[PDB]
C-alpha cells in the first residue's frame, strides 16, 4: 500500500515567507512542469495538516454534538448555523479586518484621485512645493492601488480555502451520519437525495463565504461614499442615490420575469428533448415507416414554440445588461443635471470624484449585494437541509431466538416475524427455503442487529458477517477489496481462488488482483462480482456467515461446483445461515428451514421433510487541443447573420463605445471650459460670459440618450443574431441526422446524441449568448479605456506593446496548466460521489463487519484528493489574478507618472479623465479575461454541433424517376451473389446467395441466431447498404432510398415501440385515412373494445413507451397499423420472446386468416412459423446451401434443418413432422 505522502513532497506553502505567500511566488515549479508536459494525479501537492478531512470533520462533529447537548439541556431544537458560527468564528472574525481595510482603501482612493486633479486646476510652473505634494499624493494613490490589488486577492484566496475546508468538514459529517442511519431512515431516504446533496448543497459553501462579509461592508461603504459626496458636492448626490436605489426593485422584477420565461421555455425544452430521445430510440423504425415528414414537422413546431420564449428571454436579458451598463451614466447625468440646475459651477476634480464613487457604489450594489443575498439564502437552505438530514433516527457457538416479534414498519399492524425458533450447531447447515416476501432478509437483518427486536431476545455468538444480495465492491484494487484490511495470506488466497472459481477471473482480468478497479463494477459482471464478494466474506474467517442468494448470478454447473468446493468443505466447522430457493442445494444441509410469512410450524432434517411430503415445486469525445479553430467562429456567425448584418453589428458596437467615451469626454470639456471662463471673468475681466446652460445640457442629454439607445440596440442585435445562429445550427443538425444512415446511429449511442441535443443546445441558447455579449462589452470598455489613456498622453502607447505581449504570454503560460488542473479536478470530483454511492448501497455489510472506520478513512482520502485538486485550481486562479492586477497597477502607475511629468502640456480635465479611466481597469481586466476563457470553453459545443451538420447523408428520399401508382405490382425477389458489410471496407459474413420468389407466394426464411440470423435480418431489412445485386420485381433495389424500400414493414422487435401522442397519429400521422377506416382497422385486430374504455377513444394522449399497454397490445397496434397500410410484405422477428402465449396464438391466427392474400416473408425465429410457408431458405453463416421445399430438405438426414428440429424435443419434433406432412398434403393433395 503506497502512502498518501512519500519522501517529502515539494509544498512550499508551509515553508514560504511573507513575500512568497502574499505574491504567490511559490507556484513556479508547478507551472514550469505543467507547461512542458501534462500534469497527472501524482504531480499534485499535499494539503496543509490543518486542511485534512479527518481533523476538520472531527472538530465540526464535536461542535455539532456540543450544540445538540446544549439544545437538549434547554429543551430547544438543535441548529446547525449556531454550531458553524461557534466553530469557524475565530478564523472568520480576523478575516473581517482585511475586508474593512480594502473597503477603506477603495473609499479613500477617489480622495487622492481628486487631490491630484486639484493640483492642475491651480497649477503653477514656478511652484515646487505644489509639485512635491502632487507627487506625494500620486505615490500614496499607487501604494493604495497596489495594497488593494494584492491584499484583496490574498483575502479572496484565504476565504476560498476556508470555504473549501468548511465544505470538506460538512461532507465528512454527512458521510459519518450516513454510516449510522437506521432502517427507518434508510427507508424514508434514497441514495439519490444524498448524492444530489453532496453534489449541489455542500458546494454552495465555497461561494457564500466570498460575499459573506458584504452584508455589512457594503452598506458601510455606501454610507461612507454618501457622506463623502455630501461633503464634496452637497445635496446634489441624493438624485443619483435615489436612482441607484430604485434600480433594485426594477432589477428584481426583471429577474423574476426572466426566471418565469426560463421555466416557460425549459418546459418546451424538456418536451423537445423527450421527443428527440424517443425519435433516436426508434430511428430505425422511423426510417422504416417513412414517418420523417410528420416527425420533422412536429419537432420544428416544438422548436419554434421554444425559440419564441428563448428570444423573449434573450431580449429581456439584453435589456437588463444594457441597463446595468448604462446605470452609471444615467446616475452621473441626473446628478450633474441636478447639480448644475441648482446654480453651482463645474470643476474637474469633484466631477471625476463623483463619477468614480458612483461607479464603485453601482458595482457594489448591483454585483455584490444581490449575489451576496442569494448566496446567503442558498447557504441557509443547504444548512437547514443538512441539519434535517442530521436529525434522522440513528441505530443503537450457537444462534437461537425465541418468540421473535419484529416490525419493519410500526405503522403496519401486521407482523413480519412472529414465533421464530431455530438452532445452529457446528457441523449442520441451516438452509432457509420459501417464497419471496416471506421474511428471509428480515430474519437476516435481525440476526445482524439491524432489525430492532420489538419482542423477544437476540442471542448471537462470534464475529458478524453478511453477504448482501447485491455485490458491493468499493474503491481500490481487487486484492485490497478481498483482503478487507487483513494480512495477505497465501494459502487462504489460493484456496479461495480454487474454491469459488476466482482463478478464472485472475486469468481473464488484466493484472490478476493488482487491477485498480473503481466503483460501479464497470469491468465485472454480476456473477464474478458476487463471487468476489463471497471471497471477501470468507477471507475474514468470521464465525457466523449470512449469505443472501450469492449463487443466483452463476449458471447451475459452476454454481454447484463452487458450492461443493467452498461451502461444504471449509464452512463446515463454522456457523452458516443459508437461504436459497433451490431444492438441489439441500442435500448436504441437514437442517432445512421453511417460513409461512415469517412463522415456524416445524423444523427438522431434510429426510424428515421428505417423510412429511413437502413439495418445493408447489411453492416455487475528441476535445479540441487548446484554442478552437477560427472555422467554428466563422460558421457560428455566417449561418445566422449575413456580412452586412455583421458589419452593422460591429458599427453599432463601435458607435456605442464611442458614445460611452464621448460622454465623459464632453463632461471633461465642459469642466475645462467652465474653469477657463471662471479664470477669464475673475482674472481681471470686465465682461461676464456665463456658460450657456441650455446648449451644454441639451448636448449632454442627447449623448446620454444616444449611448443608452446604442447599448440597448447592440445588445438586442447581438442576442437576436446569436439566437438565430443557434436555431439555424440546430435545424441543420436535425436535417443532417434525419438523412444520416443507420450506420451513424450504430456507432454513436443514444446517450451521446442526447447529450449533444441537451447540453450543447441549451448552452448555445442560454449561456453562450450572454457570456459572449458580456465579453464583448467588457473588451470594448477596456479598448475605450486604453484609447482614452493614449489620447490624453500619447507616450503611454510605447510601453503598451511590451505589456500586451507579456500579458498574452502570461495568459498562455497560465492556461496551459489551468486546463490540466481543471481536468484533474473534474476527474477527481466524481470518485467522491462514487464512493458515497458505494457506501450507501452496501451499508448493511459495512455495519455488519463493524469496519465503518475503514470506509470513513477511504472517504477522507477521497475528500483529501478532491481538496488537493480544488486547492491547486484556486492557487492557479489566484496566481493568475495577482499577476493580472499587478500588470494593471503597473499601467496605472505609468499613467499617473506620465500625467504628472507632462504637467505643462496637460489640462486638469485631461489628467482627471485619464486617471479616472485608469482606475477602472482593475477588476475589469480580469473580468474580460475570465469572460474570454468562458467563451473559449463554451465554444467547444459549437464544434460538436457543426460536426453533426456535415455528416455523410444517405441517398435522397425522392429522385426524378418517380414510381408509378401501381409499382410494385408483385415484388419478386432474386439474389445474385450478394454480400453484406457493416460499413464499406468492413467485416465479411454474407456471401454467395441465390434464390427465386414467385409472384404472391408466401415463403419462409430460417436462420440460426448468432450464426446466420443477424446477417439474415440485416440483409432482409437492408439497414446498411449491402454490396450486392438484389432485384425486386425484376428491378434493382439500390435505386431508391428507405422511403420506397421499407415502407412495407411490420416490425416485430424485442420491445414494440409506441410514439407518445394520439392514436390517430400513431396509426396515421399524415391523416391520409378517414375515421371509419381507423375504426375498422382497430376492430379487425380486436382493439376497439379495449380502447373504448378511455374517454377519448380516438384522440387520447398515450403515455410514454406505452405504459398503459402490454407488449401484446403494442404488437396488436403494430398489426393494426400494418393492415391499415394495406401492403404485401409481412415480417416477423422473435415473436415468442417475451409475449403471452395466448396472445401469441391470437396474433398468429389473425395474421393467418387476414394476411392470406399477399406475399408473406416470415423470418423463422421458431420452428412453428414456417408451417404454412412453401419455400424455405436455410441460411448458414451467411451462405445458402439449402433452398427448396421443407420436405425435400427434410429428406436429407445430414441437413441442419432436420437436426435443429430434433433438439427442441423428441415429441416436439414428431409433432412438427406430422403437422408438416399435414400442411403439405393440404397444399398438394387435398
Pairing of strands 577-579, 1035-1036: unpaired
CA pair distance 151, 708, nearest whole angstrom: 36
Per-residue b/e over 873-901, b at no fewer than 16 CB within 10 Å?
A: bbbbbbbbbbbbbebbbbbbbbbbbbbbe
CA pair distance 1226, 112, nearest whole angstrom: 112
Residue 585, SS3 per DSSP: helix
Residue 394, SS3 per DSSP: strand
Contact 772, 636 (CB under 8 A): no
CA pair distance 443, 404, nearest whole angstrom: 9
**What domain range is 66 assigned to?**
47-232+384-393+794-901
Same domain, 556 and 452: yes
Q: Where in 901-1019 does DSSP place strands (E)?
A: 973-976, 1003-1007
What string of DSSP letters covers 744-774? HHHHS-HHHHHHIIIIIHHIIIIIHHHHHHH
102: burial class by Cβ within 10 Å (0-12, 13-18, 19+)? buried
Hey, what's the torsion of the CAs at 1158, 1163, 1165, 1167, to 10 degrees? 60
Task: Kindly state the cell numbers that stand for 402.
Answer: 425465541
Number of alpha helices (DSSP H) and beta strands (DSSP E) in the chain: 46, 10
DSSP state of 622: -
- What's the distance, Cα to Cα, between the start and end of the chain in Å? 82
**Which backbone phi and psi does 465 adopt, to 5 degrees?**
-140, 150
Q: Give the bridge partners for 578, in sequence order.
A: 431
Same domain, 465 and 388: no
500: burial class by Cβ within 10 Å (0-12, 13-18, 19+)? buried
237 sits in which H/E element: helix 237-281
Contact 804, 349 (CB under 8 A): no
The closest alpha carbon to 1058, from 1102, 1091, 1089, belongs to 1102
What string of DSSP letters covers 526-566? HHHHHHHHHHHHHHT--S--BB-S-SSSS-HHHHHHHHHHH
In a domain, 832, yes or no: yes
Task: Kindly state the cell numbers that stand for 134.
Answer: 502632487
Contact 130, 124 (CB under 8 A): yes
CA pair distance 670, 115, nearest whole angstrom: 20
What's the angle, vertex CA 390, arms to CA 389 and CA 392, rounded to 5? 75
DSSP state of 1060: S
Check which CATH number belongs to the domain holding 1194 and give it: 3.40.50.300
Q: Give the bridge partners for 1030, in sequence order.
A: 975
Q: In this structure, is the dihedral angle defined by the CA atoms of residues 815, 816, 820 and 823, taken in order, positive or negative?
A: positive
Same domain, 436 and 388: no
Measured CA distances, 802 to 793, 806, 809, 815 (Å): 17, 6, 10, 20
CA pair distance 1110, 1117, nearest whole angstrom: 10
Measured CA distances, 472 to 457, 550, 577, 778, 839 (Å): 30, 12, 19, 52, 8
CA pair distance 496, 502, nearest whole angstrom: 7
DSSP state of 207: H
Q: In this structure, is the dihedral angle defined by the CA atoms of residues 1065, 1068, 1071 and 1076, taken in order, positive or negative?
A: negative
Domain stops at, among 833, 868, 901: 901
Q: Residue 278, Cα to own-chain centre: how many angstroms?
A: 20
Contact 751, 313 (CB under 8 A): no
The closest alpha carbon to 167, from 199, 198, 200, 202, belongs to 202
Task: Kindly state the cell numbers that stand for 933.
Answer: 476563457
819-827: Cβ within 8 A, 24+ apart: 819/626, 820/34, 820/38, 820/39, 821/34, 821/39, 821/869, 821/872, 821/873, 821/876, 822/873, 824/39, 824/40, 824/41, 824/44, 824/869, 824/872, 825/866, 825/869, 825/870, 825/872, 825/873
What's the angle, vertex CA 1035, arms to CA 1031 and CA 1038, rounded to 5? 65
CA pair distance 531, 484, nearest whole angstrom: 15
In a domain, 611, yes or no: yes
In a domain, 946, yes or no: no
Q: What sections of 955-1069 are H helices per DSSP?
A: 1014-1021, 1063-1067
In a domain, 823, yes or no: yes
Q: Pick out the residues of the known binding site.
A: 434-441, 1007-1014
Same domain, 606 and 541: yes
Contact 274, 1104 (CB under 8 A): yes
DSSP state of 1055: S
Total of domains in the chain: 3
In a domain, 32, yes or no: no
Q: What is the largest CA-CA distance in the chain?
A: 137
CA pair distance 772, 938, nearest whole angstrom: 9
295: burial class by Cβ within 10 Å (0-12, 13-18, 19+)? buried
Same domain, 447 and 388: no
Look-up: residue for cell 453599432? 652
Look-up: residue for cell 435443429? 1204
In a domain, 81, yes or no: yes
Q: Residue 420, Cα to own-chain centre: how many angstroms?
A: 49
470: burial class by Cβ within 10 Å (0-12, 13-18, 19+)? middle
Domain stops at, among 901, 936, 961: 901
Task: Kindly state the cell numbers that stand for 778.
Answer: 467588457
CA pair distance 663, 658, nearest whole angstrom: 9
171: burial class by Cβ within 10 Å (0-12, 13-18, 19+)? buried
Contact 354, 335 (CB under 8 A): yes
In a domain, 567, yes or no: yes
CA pair distance 35, 540, nearest whole angstrom: 48
Q: Which residues contact 688 (CB under 8 A, 6 or more apart)?
A: 681
Same domain, 388 and 489: no
Per-residue b/e over 745-779, b at no fewer than 16 CB within 10 Å?
A: beeeeeeebeebbbebbbbbbbebbbbbbbbbbbb
Crossing angle (nearest 10°) for helices 348-363 and 95-121:
160
Contact 844, 450 (CB under 8 A): yes
**Which backbone phi and psi does 1006 adopt, to 5 degrees?**
-120, 140
Method underlying the structure: cryo-EM
The tally of CA atoms less than 13 A away on the side-chain side of residue 980 is 23
CA pair distance 753, 761, nearest whole angstrom: 11
Q: Give the bridge partners for 975, in sequence order.
A: 1030
Residue 12, SS3 per DSSP: coil
**Which backbone phi and psi does 181 adopt, to 5 degrees?**
-70, 135
Crossing angle (nearest 10°) for helices 643-682 and 908-918:
140
CA pair distance 919, 113, nearest whole angstrom: 9
Domain stops at, among 856, 886, 901: 901
Same domain, 389 and 497: no
The closest alpha carbon to 330, from 786, 774, 719, 709, belongs to 709
- Conformational region of residue 688, where left means phi above 0, alpha means psi within -120 to 50, and beta covers everything else: beta
Neighbours of 202 (CB within 10 A): 20
Same domain, 388 and 450: no
CA pair distance 373, 386, nearest whole angstrom: 20
DSSP state of 629: P
Task: Kindly state the cell numbers that stand for 993.
Answer: 446467395
SS3 content of the chain, % helix, strand, coil (to 5): 60, 5, 35
Contact 460, 417 (CB under 8 A): no
Q: Pick out the residues of the known binding site for ATP.
A: 434-441, 1007-1014
Same domain, 388 and 451: no
DSSP state of 41: G
The closest alpha carbon to 201, from 176, 165, 174, belongs to 174
Q: What sections of 1050-1110 are H helices per DSSP?
A: 1063-1067, 1075-1084, 1088-1091
In a domain, 1111, yes or no: yes
Same domain, 537 and 388: no
CA pair distance 349, 216, nearest whole angstrom: 29
Contact 172, 54 (CB under 8 A): yes
Q: Which residues contact 204 (CB under 8 A, 6 or more apart)?
A: 375, 378, 379, 382
CA pair distance 143, 893, nearest whole angstrom: 9
CA pair distance 213, 5, nearest whole angstrom: 36
Same domain, 389 and 538: no
The closest alpha carbon to 347, from 113, 667, 116, 661, belongs to 667
Q: Give the bridge partners for 1036, in sequence order.
A: 1031
Same domain, 388 and 503: no
Check which CATH number belongs to the domain holding 109 and give it: 1.20.1560
Crossing angle (nearest 10°) for helices 643-682 and 348-363:
140
Q: What sections of 74-204 are H helices per DSSP?
A: 80-88, 90-93, 95-121, 128-178, 183-187, 191-196
Hey, what's the torsion of the CAs at 39, 43, 48, 54, to 10 degrees? 100
Amino acid at each position: 500500500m503506497l502512502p498518501v505522502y512519500q519522501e517529502v513532497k515539494p509544498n512550499p506553502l508551509q515553508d514560504a515567507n511573507l513575500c512568497s505567500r502574499v505574491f504567490f511566488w511559490w507556484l513556479n515549479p508547478l507551472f514550469k512542469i505543467g507547461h512542458k508536459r501534462r500534469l497527472e494525479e501524482d504531480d499534485m501537492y499535499s494539503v496543509l495538516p490543518e486542511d485534512r478531512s479527518q481533523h476538520l470533520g472531527e472538530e465540526l462533529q464535536g461542535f455539532w454534538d456540543k450544540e445538540v447537548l446544549r439544545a437538549e439541556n434547554d429543551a430547544q431544537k438543535p441548529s446547525l448555523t449556531r454550531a458553524i458560527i461557534k466553530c469557524y468564528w475565530k478564523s472568520y472574525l480576523v478575516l473581517g479586518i482585511f475586508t474593512l481595510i480594502e473597503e477603506s482603501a477603495k473609499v479613500i482612493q477617489p480622495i487622492f484621485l481628486g487631490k491630484i486633479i486639484n493640483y492642475f486646476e491651480n497649477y503653477d510652473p514656478m511652484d515646487s512645493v505644489a509639485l512635491n505634494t502632487a507627487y506625494a499624493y500620486a505615490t500614496v494613490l499607487t501604494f493604495c492601488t497596489l495594497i488593494l490589488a494584492i491584499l484583496h486577492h490574498l483575502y479572496f484566496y484565504h476565504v476560498q480555502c476556508a470555504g473549501m475546508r468548511l465544505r470538506v468538514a460538512m461532507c465528512h459529517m454527512i458521510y459519518r451520519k450516513a454510516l449510522r442511519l437506521s432502517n427507518m431512515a434508510m427507508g424514508k431516504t434514497t441514495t439519490g437525495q444524498i448524492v444530489n446533496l453532496l453534489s449541489n448543497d455542500v458546494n454552495k459553501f465555497d461561494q457564500v463565504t466570498v460575499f459573506l462579509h458584504f452584508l455589512w461592508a457594503g452598506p458601510l461603504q455606501a454610507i461612507a461614499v454618501t457622506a463623502l459626496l455630501w461633503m464634496e458636492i452637497g445635496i446634489s448626490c441624493l438624485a443619483g442615490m435615489a436612482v441607484l436605489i430604485i434600480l433594485l426593485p426594477l432589477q428584481s422584477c426583471f429577474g423574476k420575469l426572466f426566471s418565469s420565461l426560463r421555466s416557460k421555455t425549459a418546459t418546451f425544452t424538456d418536451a423537445r428533448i423527450r421527443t428527440m430521445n424517443e425519435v433516436i430510440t426508434g430511428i430505425r423504425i422511423i426510417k422504416m415507416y417513412a414517418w420523417e415528414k410528420s416527425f420533422s414537422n412536429l419537432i420544428t413546431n416544438l422548436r419554434k414554440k421554444e425559440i419564441s420564449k428563448i428570444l423573449r428571454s434573450s431580449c429581456l436579458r439584453g435589456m437588463n445588461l444594457a441597463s446595468f451598463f448604462s446605470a452609471s451614466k444615467i446616475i452621473v447625468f441626473v446628478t450633474f443635471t441636478t447639480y448644475v440646475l441648482l446654480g453651482s459651477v463645474i470643476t474637474a476634480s469633484r466631477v471625476f470624484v463623483a463619477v468614480t464613487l458612483y461607479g464603485a457604489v453601482r458595482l457594489t450594489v448591483t454585483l455584490f449585494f444581490p449575489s451576496a443575498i442569494e448566496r446567503v439564502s442558498e447557504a441557509i437552505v443547504s444548512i437547514r437541509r443538512i441539519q434535517t438530514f442530521l436529525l434522522l433516527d440513528e441505530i443503537s457457538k450457537m444462534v437461537h431466538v425465541q418468540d421473535f416479534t419484529a416490525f419493519w414498519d410500526k405503522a403496519s399492524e401486521t407482523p413480519t416475524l412472529q414465533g421464530l425458533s431455530f438452532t445452529v450447531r457446528p457441523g449442520e447447515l441451516l438452509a432457509v427455503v420459501g417464497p419471496v416476501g416471506a421474511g428471509k432478509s428480515s430474519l437476516l437483518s435481525a440476526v445482524l442487529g439491524e432489525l430492532a427486536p420489538s419482542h423477544g431476545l437476540v442471542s448471537v455468538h462470534g464475529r458478524i458477517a453478511y453477504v448482501s444480495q447485491q455485490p458491493w465492491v468499493f474503491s481500490g484494487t481487487l486484492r485490497s477489496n478481498i483482503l478487507f484490511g487483513k494480512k495477505y495470506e497465501k494459502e487462504r488466497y489460493e484456496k479461495v481462488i480454487k474454491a469459488c472459481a476466482l482463478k478464472k477471473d485472475l486469468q481473464l482480468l488484466e493484472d490478476g488482483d493488482l487491477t485498480v478497479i473503481g466503483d460501479r463494477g464497470t469491468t465485472l459482471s454480476g456473477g464474478q462480482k458476487a463471487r468476489v464478494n463471497l471471497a471477501r466474506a470468507v477471507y475474514q474467517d468470521a464465525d457466523i456467515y449470512l449469505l443472501d442468494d450469492p449463487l443466483s448470478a452463476v449458471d447451475a454447473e459452476v454454481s454447484r461446483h463452487l458450492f461443493e468446493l467452498c461451502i461444504c468443505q471449509i464452512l463446515h466447522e463454522k456457523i452458516t445461515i443459508l437461504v436459497t430457493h433451490q431444492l438441489q442445494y439441500l442435500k448436504a444441509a441437514s437442517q432445512i428451514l421453511i417460513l409461512k410469512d415469517g412463522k415456524m410450524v416445524q423444523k427438522g432434517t431434510y429426510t424428515e421433510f421428505l417423510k412429511s411430503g413437502i413439495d418445493f415445486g408447489s411453492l416455487l469525445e475528441n476535445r479540441s487541443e487548446g484554442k478552437v479553430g477560427f472555422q467554428a467562429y466563422k460558421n457560428y456567425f455566417r449561418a445566422g447573420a449575413h456580412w452586412i448584418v455583421f458589419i452593422f453589428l460591429i458599427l453599432l458596437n463601435t458607435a456605442a463605445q464611442v458614445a460611452y467615451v464621448l460622454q465623459d469626454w464632453w463632461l471633461s470639456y465642459w469642466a475645462n471650459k467652465q474653469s477657463m471662463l471662471n479664470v477669464t471673468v475673475n482674472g481681471g475681466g470686465n465682461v461676464t460670459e456665463k456658460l450657456d446652460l441650455n446648449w451644454y445640457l441639451g448636448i449632454y442629454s442627447g449623448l446620454t440618450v444616444a449611448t443608452v439607445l446604442f447599448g440597448i440596440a447592440r445588445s438586442l442585435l447581438v442576442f437576436y443574431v446569436l439566437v438565430n445562429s443557434s436555431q439555424t445550427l440546430h435545424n441543420k443538425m436535425f436535417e443532417s441526422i434525419l438523412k444520416a444512415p443507420v450506420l451513424f446511429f450504430d456507432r454513436n449511442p443514444i446517450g451521446r446524441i442526447l447529450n449533444r441535443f441537451s447540453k450543447d443546445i441549451g448552452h448555445l441558447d442560454d449561456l453562450l449568448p450572454l457570456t459572449f455579449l458580456d465579453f464583448i462589452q467588457t473588451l470594448l470598455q477596456v479598448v475605450g479605456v486604453v484609447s482614452v489613456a493614449v489620447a490624453v498622453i500619447p507616450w503611454i502607447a510605447i510601453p503598451l506593446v511590451p505589456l500586451g505581449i507579456i500579458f498574452i504570454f502570461l495568459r498562455r503560460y497560465f492556461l496551459e496548466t489551468s486546463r490540466d488542473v481543471k481536468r484533474l479536478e473534474s476527474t477527481t470530483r466524481s470518485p467522491v460521489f462514487s464512493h458515497l454511492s458505494s457506501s450507501l448501497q452496501g451499508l448493511w455489510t459495512i455495519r455488519a463487519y463493524k469496519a465503518e472506520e475503514r470506509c470513513q478513512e477511504l472517504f477522507d482520502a477521497h475528500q483529501d484528493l478532491h481538496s488537493e485538486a480544488w486547492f491547486l485550481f484556486l492557487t492557479t486562479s489566484r496566481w493568475f489574478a495577482v499577476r493580472l492586477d499587478a500588470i494593471c497597477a503597473m499601467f496605472v502607475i505609468i499613467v499617473a507618472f506620465g500625467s504628472l511629468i507632462l504637467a505643462k502640456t496637460l489640462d486638469a480635465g485631461q489628467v482627471g479623465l485619464a486617471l479616472s479611466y485608469a482606475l477602472t481597469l482593475m477588476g475589469m481586466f480580469q473580468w474580460c479575461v475570465r469572460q474570454s476563457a468562458e467563451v473559449e470553453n463554451m465554444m467547444i459545443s459549437v464544434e460538436r454541433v457543426i460536426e453533426y451538420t456535415d455528416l455523410e447523408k444517405e441517398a435522397p428520399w425522392e429522385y426524378q424517376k418517380r414510381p408509378p401508382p401501381a409499382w410494385p405490382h408483385e415484388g419478386v425477389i432474386i439474389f445474385d451473389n450478394v454480400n453484406f458489410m457493416y460499413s464499406p471496407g468492413g467485416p465479411l459474413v454474407l456471401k454467395h446467395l441465390t434464390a427465386l420468389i414467385k409472384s404472391q407466394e408466401k415463403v419462409g426464411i430460417v436462420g440460426r441466431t448468432g450464426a446466420g440470423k443477424s446477417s439474415l435480418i440485416s440483409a432482409l431489412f437492408r439497414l446498411s447498404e449491402p454490396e450486392g445485386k438484389i432485384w425486386i420485381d425484376k428491378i434493382l433495389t439500390t435505386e431508391i432510398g428507405l422511403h420506397d424500400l421499407r415502407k412495407k414493414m411490420s416490425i416485430i422487435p424485442q420491445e414494440p415501440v409506441l410514439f407518445t401522442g394520439t392514436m390517430r397519429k400513431n396509426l396515421d400521422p399524415f391523416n391520409e385515412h378517414t375515421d371509419e377506416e381507423l375504426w375498422n382497422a382497430l376492430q379487425e385486430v380486436q382493439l376497439k373494445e379495449t380502447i373504448e374504455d378511455l374517454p377519448g377513444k380516438m384522440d387520447t394522449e398515450l403515455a410514454e413507451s406505452g405504459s398503459n399497454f402490454s407488449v401484446g397490445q403494442r404488437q396488436l397496434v403494430c398489426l393494426a397499423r400494418a393492415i391499415l397500410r394495406k401492403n404485401q410484405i409481412l415480417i416477423i422477428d422473435e415473436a415468442t420472446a417475451n409475449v403471452d402465449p395466448r396472445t401469441d396464438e391470437l396474433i398468429q391466427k389473425k395474421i393467418r386468416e387476414k394476411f392470406a392474400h399477399c406475399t408473406v416473408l416470415t423470418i423463422a425465429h421458431r420452428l412453428n412459423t414456417i408451417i404454412d410457408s412453401d419455400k424455405i431458405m436455410v441460411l448458414d453463416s451467411g451462405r445458402l446451401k439449402e433452398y427448396d421445399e421443407p420436405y425435400v430438405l427434410l429428406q436429407n438426414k445430414e441437413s441442419l434443418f432436420y437436426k435443429m428440429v430434433q433438439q427442441l424435443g423428441k415429441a416436439e419434433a414428431a409433432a412438427l413432422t406430422e403437422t408438416a406432412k399435414q400442411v403439405y398434403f393440404k397444399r398438394n393433395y387435398p
